[PDB]
Amino acid sequence: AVSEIQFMHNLGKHLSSMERVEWLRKKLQDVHNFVAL
C-alpha cells in the first residue's frame, strides 16, 4: 500500500475538515507572524 505522496495528497485535497482545520491557521500566520523583511 502507498504511504508517502499518494498518502496525504489523497486525504487533504479540499483542506477544510478535521486534520485539515489546524492547517489553515498556518496559511494566514506563516507570512504575517514573521515577514518584516
Which method, experimentally, gave rise to this model? NMR
Q: For the chain, what is the radius of gyration of the CA atoms?
A: 13
DSSP 5-31: SHHHHTTSSS--SSSTTHHHHHHHHTT
Coil, strand or helix at 2: coil
* C-alpha to C-alpha distances, 32 to 26, 29, 35, nearest whole angstrom: 10, 5, 6
Backbone angles phi, psi at 23, to 5 degrees: -45, -55
- Check: CB of residue 19 under 8 Å from CB of residue 28: no
d(CA 18, CA 2): 22
**Beta carbons of 10 and 4 less than 8 angstroms apart:** no
- Tell me the domain boundaries of the chain: 1-37
Asked if 19 and 12 touch (Cβ cutoff 8 Å), the reply is: yes
Distance CA 8, CA 16 (A): 14
Tell me the C-alpha distance between 36 and 9, whole Å: 32
